[PDB]
């Protein structure tokens, strides 16, 4: 007899879904993932909840100040975003010490600023717990509770726990292939040579965005092959593709970001605005996205700034990739691809270097001025672009390995996440210890 209990609120919107508020005990009939069969022991009534909206009953998940599946760059990012202040601090999961705990806290200096400093949890051998050997607690909760009261060592007092979201309700179970009927598109975003994009409604219940192919020389079969497989390209980097309209002109429906691209976001109010830091956190996004399509053996193609999305609270997720395998940019395109045709991961190395620069540039034409013959001929010749004024000259210096001619010579995805994730912290630096 499986109980759980709920982490969040959440209003049905199917026909077989339960609505729940947070707090309420449910037992579990059936896991099945993303949705589970349950009954709430508050009205009774058997139906379908969504798995990530429940945690087992006095769990660890239960808790405010604990946060599961968080790596220490995610920490930051979301203990730096509005909302939260000095003492802002998460218990969550080792990334480096997998069956640990670590901890982080908002802290605060002139020289720097706000910052996210994290402690190592040691777990006892007893069953205890301790950042400080001459400090051990029974559970995790006294832990907080005394660092919450005084110092002690660290470089705050814990204040609230971090601030969180609901996360996104997942798709109708068994929807991936759906009838045009299904779909209100409701204003066109976008148009291009091959199609539209249109912010639409999923059965009345869903904001969605939808991609109409024109009829095309691409085969529907061909394509729904690839379809399947971009279907299981799921990270939290990537934009999430939901469902499949299968008959021409083909529709293709993923989550809706509030920001549009990040090419017309940089080049917003809001973008102009954005500090140097940022721009850097937004490439280290990428490169993590990047890293997971690299380890996977996948190839995006078409890597620009227009090929990226923004979320409404700035994250960064990576959309149209291996589409052009399916179906200009030469100003992205790597030499060995445009002479040869020849795409790899390392091609996309190549494009991610203009990329960078279109970020630091606030979205700014990458060679300006120049025709794309005109730059043709200067590469081959050895030119590069120039470092803008605000470029520092560390973050040059990755652009440049990034354009070396031999595709072999430029780094991986997996080495620059690393670099960009820390750009602003020493190795040791990383985390904190306390005698
Ligand atoms: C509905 O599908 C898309 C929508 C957008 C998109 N563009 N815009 C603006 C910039 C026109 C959006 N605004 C908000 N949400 C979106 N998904 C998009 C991008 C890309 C896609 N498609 C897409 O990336 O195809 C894959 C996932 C199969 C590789
Ligand atoms: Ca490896
Ligand atoms: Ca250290
Ligand atoms: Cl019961």
């Given at each position: 007899?499986?109980?759980?209990?709920?982490?969040?609120?959440?209003?049905?919107?199917?026909?077989?879904?339960?609505?729940?508020?947070?707090?309420?005990?449910?037992?579990?009939?059936?896991?099945?993932?993303?949705?589970?069969?349950?009954?709430?022991?508050?009205?009774?009534?058997?139906?379908?909840?969504?798995?990530?909206?429940?945690?087992?009953?006095?769990?660890?998940?239960?808790?405010?100040?604990?946060?599961?599946?968080?790596?220490?760059?995610?920490?930051?990012?979301?203990?730096?975003?509005?909302?939260?202040?000095?003492?802002?601090?998460?218990?969550?999961?080792?990334?480096?010490?997998?069956?640990?705990?670590?901890?982080?806290?908002?802290?605060?200096?002139?020289?720097?600023?706000?910052?996210?400093?994290?402690?190592?949890?040691?777990?006892?051998?007893?069953?205890?717990?301790?950042?400080?050997?001459?400090?051990?607690?029974?559970?995790?909760?006294?832990?907080?509770?005394?660092?919450?009261?005084?110092?002690?060592?660290?470089?705050?007092?814990?204040?609230?726990?971090?601030?969180?979201?609901?996360?996104?309700?997942?798709?109708?179970?068994?929807?991936?292939?759906?009838?045009?009927?299904?779909?209100?598109?409701?204003?066109?975003?976008?148009?291009?040579?091959?199609?539209?994009?249109?912010?639409?409604?999923?059965?009345?219940?869903?904001?969605?965005?939808?991609?109409?192919?024109?009829?095309?020389?691409?085969?529907?079969?061909?394509?729904?092959?690839?379809?399947?497989?971009?279907?299981?390209?799921?990270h939290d980097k990537l934009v999430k593709?939901?469902?499949?309209?299968?008959?021409?002109?083909?529709?293709?429906?993923?989550?809706?970001?509030?920001?549009?691209?990040?090419?017309?976001?940089?080049?917003?109010?809001?973008?102009?605005?954005?500090?140097?830091?940022?721009?850097?956190?937004?490439?280290?996004?990428?490169?993590?996205?990047?890293?997971?399509?690299?380890?996977?053996?996948?190839?995006?193609?078409?890597?620009?700034?227009?090929?990226?999305?923004?979320?409404?609270?700035?994250?960064?997720?990576?959309?149209?990739?291996?589409?052009?395998?399916?179906?200009?940019?030469?100003?992205?395109?790597?030499?060995?691809?445009?002479?040869?045709?020849?795409?790899?991961?390392?091609?996309?190395?190549?494009?991610?270097?203009?990329?960078?620069?279109?970020?630091?540039?606030?979205?700014?034409?990458?060679?300006?001025?120049?025709?794309?013959?005109?730059?043709?001929?200067?590469?081959?010749?050895?030119?590069?672009?120039?470092?803008?004024?605000?470029?520092?000259?560390?973050?040059?210096?990755?652009?440049?390995?990034?354009w070396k001619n031999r595709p072999e010579?430029?780094?991986?995805?997996?080495?620059?996440?690393?670099?960009?994730?820390?750009?602003?912290?020493?190795?040791?630096?990383?985390?904190?210890?306390?005698?």
């Open positions: 007899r499986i109980i759980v209990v709920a982490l969040y609120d959440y209003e049905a919107i199917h026909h077989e879904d339960l609505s729940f508020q947070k707090g309420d005990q449910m037992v579990v009939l059936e896991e099945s993932g993303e949705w589970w069969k349950a009954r709430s022991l508050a009205t009774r009534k058997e139906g379908y909840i969504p798995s990530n909206y429940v945690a087992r009953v006095d769990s660890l998940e239960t808790e405010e100040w604990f946060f599961k599946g968080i790596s220490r760059k995610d920490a930051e990012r979301q203990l730096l975003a509005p909302g939260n202040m000095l003492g802002s601090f998460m218990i969550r999961d080792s990334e480096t010490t997998k069956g640990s705990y670590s901890l982080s806290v908002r802290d605060y200096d002139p020289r720097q600023g706000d910052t996210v400093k994290h402690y190592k949890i040691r777990t006892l051998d007893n069953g205890g717990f301790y950042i400080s050997p001459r400090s051990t607690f029974s559970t995790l909760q006294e832990l907080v509770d005394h660092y919450k009261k005084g110092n002690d060592g660290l470089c705050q007092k814990l204040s609230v726990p971090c601030m969180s979201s609901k996360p996104q309700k997942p798709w109708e179970k068994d929807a991936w292939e759906i009838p045009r009927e299904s779909l209100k598109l409701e204003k066109k975003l976008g148009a291009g040579q091959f199609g539209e994009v249109w912010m639409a409604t999923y059965n009345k219940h869903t904001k969605v965005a939808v991609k109409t192919m024109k009829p095309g020389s691409m085969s529907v079969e061909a394509f729904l092959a690839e379809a399947n497989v971009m279907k299981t390209l799921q593709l939901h469902a499949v309209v299968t008959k021409e002109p083909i529709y293709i429906i993923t989550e809706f970001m509030a920001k549009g691209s990040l090419l017309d976001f940089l080049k917003s109010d809001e973008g102009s605005k954005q500090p140097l830091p940022k721009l850097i956190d937004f490439s280290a996004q990428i490169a993590e996205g990047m890293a997971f399509i690299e380890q996977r053996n996948y190839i995006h193609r078409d890597l620009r700034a227009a090929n990226i999305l923004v979320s409404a609270s700035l994250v960064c997720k990576i959309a149209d990739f291996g589409l052009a395998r399916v179906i200009f940019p030469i100003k992205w395109t790597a030499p060995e691809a445009i002479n040869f045709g020849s795409f790899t991961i390392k091609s996309d190395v190549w494009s991610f270097g203009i990329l960078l620069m279109e970020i630091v540039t606030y979205g700014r034409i990458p060679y300006p001025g120049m025709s794309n013959p005109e730059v043709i001929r200067a590469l081959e010749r050895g030119y590069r672009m120039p470092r803008p004024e605000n470029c520092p000259e560390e973050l040059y210096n990755i652009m440049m390995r990034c010579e430029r780094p991986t995805f997996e080495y620059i996440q690393s670099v960009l994730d820390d750009f602003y912290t020493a190795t040791e630096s990383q985390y904190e210890e306390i005698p």
